[PDB]
Each structure stands twice: as C-alpha cells, then as structure tokens.
C-alpha cells in the first residue's frame, strides 16, 4: 500500500521491503542450528533458476540447507530416500522447517 503511495512522496517507495518475503526452505535441527542437509527437487534445472547471469538435460536437482525455493518449485521439493534428518513438517508447506534426527 505505502509503496503504491509513492506518487505523492517517492521516499515511500522503500516500503516494499516489508512485502519482500524470502521464498526459501530452511532446515533446523533441535539445536536451532543449520545442519548441512541436502534437499532434493524433481524439477528440471531450467524451469527454476536465474537465466543468463552476467546428459542432454536432467530432471533432478539438489539444494543446501539454506535453499532458494519458490512456490512453484516447492511442491516438487523433497529429500533423499535416507538421511540423518527427516522434515517434520511436509516440505510442500514450505517455510522454515524442523528436521527430526536419527540416532546420530
């Protein structure tokens, strides 16, 4: 609202900082820390990436614990078959999730 209200005062153009919502999935252990987990997405690495920054083609991708995940590239997001960490909240929900741990 305040950003759109910039005609009468340009300095109000910065209010989009509020609207900017990081689109990401972050895995946290029981220690409120970031384990080096690897999420798996069954999406081609051209349907979801930054284009032209300044095997023919796989249907496979992997991301680190801090992961850039968009609403479109979140439903197909998953994790490997077996891992030390299992996402308590389904990945399809998105957001910052917690990872239940195995024995060690």
């Amino acid at each position: 609202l305040v950003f759109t209200q910039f005609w009468f005062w340009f300095p109000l153009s910065h209010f989009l900082s509020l609207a900017y919502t990081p689109t990401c999935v972050i895995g946290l252990n029981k220690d409120l820390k970031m384990p080096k987990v690897q999420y798996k997405s069954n999406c081609k690495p051209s349907t979801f990436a930054y284009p032209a920054p300044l095997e023919p083609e796989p249907n496979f991708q992997l991301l680190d614990n801090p992961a850039r995940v968009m609403p479109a590239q979140l439903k197909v997001l998953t994790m490997p078959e077996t891992c030390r960490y299992q996402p308590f909240k389904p990945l399809s929900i998105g957001g910052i999730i917690i990872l239940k741990d195995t024995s060690e």
């Binding site: 509020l18 957001g95 917690i98």
Partner: protein, 326 residues
C-alpha cells in the same frame, strides 16, 4: 461469528486424535485470535518435552500471527528455563529475522551488469533516484553496499530529498541487520539525518526493540522539519501494530506542529503505529485534523494513516467508510 464457531469445533476435534495435528490447531488459533489457548498449549508442549514440534509451531506462529498476538502469547507464557528462553527468542523475532538475514546474505545472486547499464543510461535526477530504489530493491536483506561504496560521487550528486532516499536505500539494504544499528549508521545535513532515522525504522520494520525508544528521544529532540519527518517515518515503521501511548503522543504532537513535510510523515506514522487498532479517539483525532488543516501534504499523510489504522476490522468499518466516501 460462524467462522469462529467452526474454528472452535475444528480445534476441539483436532485435539482428539492419536496424532494431534497441532500445526493445524495453531493455524486455527492464529485465524481465531484468542492467544491464551495457544499459550496454554505451548506450555503443555514444554511440559511434554516435544521440542521439535513445539518449535515448529513457534516458527509457524512467528511467520503467520500478528505482533499483538505474539506479544499476548509471550506475556501469557511469562505468567525448563532454557527451553522457555529459546522459545521466547523464536516467538519474539530473536533469531527468526537472523535466520533469514544469514540465508539472504549467502544467497545473493545479484547481477550488477544490469545496474551498470542503467546508470550508464541515467541522465536526470528522476532516473538517479529510480536507480537508487532499484539497487535497494535488489539488495533488501543482503547487505552488499556495492554501489553505495564504489561510487561516492554518483551518490553525492543527488541532494535535497535524495539524500533521504539514498539513506532509506541504506536502510533497505541493511534490513534485518538489527544488531549493528546506530553503530552502522555512524557511517553517515537535515536530509541525511531524517533519512538515517527512516533507515533505522526500515531496518527495524515491525520489530519494536530499544530502537523505538531511541527514535522517540531523537524525534523529541528534533529541530528541523526534515529530521522530524524522517524520525516520524522511522518511529512509525518500527512501531507498526505496537500501539504505544507514548509513541502516539509524540507523533500527534509532531502532527499538530502544522508543517506539511513533518505532517505527512506524522499522519502516516500514526496510521502505522495504530494499524488495525480501531480506537475511536485516534480515528476521531485524525479525521478532525484532516478536516481542519489546510496542507494537502498533511491530508495525504492522514489519508494513508486513516487507511492503515484499520488494517483488520473487516465488517465493523462501514460507518467510517461511509463518512469518508461522503
């Protein structure tokens, strides 16, 4: 009313399963308000020692619930210790903004060639300010002060209410980096000071720490209209939702100081501070000042503020809506 009743029934049912789906229960409570129930459930989680899910629920609560709801939950919990403190930190922003800040800092795949081309194309103050805003928009939490460190002369070219915009861009790029406030604005005129206060508010957007008190003191001690405008913007931005009587009083005094530059910011900041509150006193005061004053800038600010003061309150607004429309 019927939606609330259905939510009550759904919450009660969810609290009857072999695997109680507390994430959906907490979503229902968020949509229902009533923070006491979620606070009691949260203490029950602490007692049961279910830290994983008891922490996922807190992440969800911070993500969705409003600041007032979060504060109510916090005070309810006030009325073991390490778990309580970690949970309170998570609920009241602590580490919740830091996680996103660190994530965005490391994931900052920006492309500065686009902005090099843009600034090559810039020829006037409008485009200069637009490029400043674009740089701020591309950085956001990512604190890469790349251009604003490399090109001091290009930044220094624009003046007047362009120092304000550049400092607000500093606030945007430093957003989330709440730890180094004051210490970090020590890097950087009335326009500069107002922009710095607005940048502090922007960095602490929707996070009412001691920066609210700092902004209150600086706005009380403010001497120029530009600095008062910047301080009001920053204070309201920091205290959005957190309806505080002292903040309201200072902002109202600044508004009643009938200067257009400070008046617009004062109206917008009153609206921000009292967002969703719907107190007849402030609604009446703002409408009366809008109808009394003779400064179109102050009218614009008060219009935005009156719009914001009722963010929620969907149906119980028709009286004010009709009055304003007529």
């Amino acid at each position: 009313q019927f939606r609330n009743k259905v939510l009550r029934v759904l919450v009660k049912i969810y609290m009857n399963l072999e695997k109680p789906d507390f994430i959906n229960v907490c979503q229902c409570l968020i949509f229902l308000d009533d923070p006491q129930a979620v606070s009691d459930i949260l203490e029950k989680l602490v007692k049961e020692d279910n830290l994983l899910m008891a922490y996922q629920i807190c992440f969800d609560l911070y993500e969705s619930a409003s600041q007032q709801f979060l504060s109510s939950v916090i005070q309810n919990l006030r009325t073991p210790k390490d778990q309580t403190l970690k949970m309170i930190k998570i609920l009241s922003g602590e580490m919740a903004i830091e996680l996103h800040l660190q994530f965005l800092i490391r994931n900052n795949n920006t492309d500065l060639m686009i902005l090099k081309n843009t600034k090559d194309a810039v020829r006037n103050s409008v485009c200069h300010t637009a490029t400043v805003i674009a740089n701020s928009f591309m950085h956001c939490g990512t604190t890469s002060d790349q251009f604003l460190r490399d090109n001091l002369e290009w930044l220094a070219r624009a003046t007047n209410w362009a120092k304000f915009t550049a400092t607000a861009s500093l606030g945007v790029i430093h957003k989330g980096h709440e730890k180094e406030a004051l210490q970090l604005m020590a890097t950087y005129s009335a326009y500069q000071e107002g922009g710095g206060l607005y940048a502090l508010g922007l960095i602490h957007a929707n996070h009412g720490g001691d920066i609210i008190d700092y902004l209150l003191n600086q706005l009380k001690n403010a001497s120029n209209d530009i600095v008062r405008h910047g301080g009001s913007l920053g204070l309201g931005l920091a205290a959005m939702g957190t309806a505080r009587q002292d903040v309201y009083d200072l902002l109202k005094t600044n508004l009643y100081q009938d200067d257009a530059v400070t008046g617009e910011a004062a109206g917008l900041a009153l609206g921000l501070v009292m967002l969703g509150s719907k107190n007849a006193q402030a609604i009446e005061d703002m409408v009366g000042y809008a109808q009394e004053t003779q400064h179109e800038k102050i009218l614009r600010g008060l219009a935005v503020g009156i719009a914001l003061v009722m963010y929620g309150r969907m149906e119980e607004a028709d009286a004010l809506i009709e009055s304003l429309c007529r």
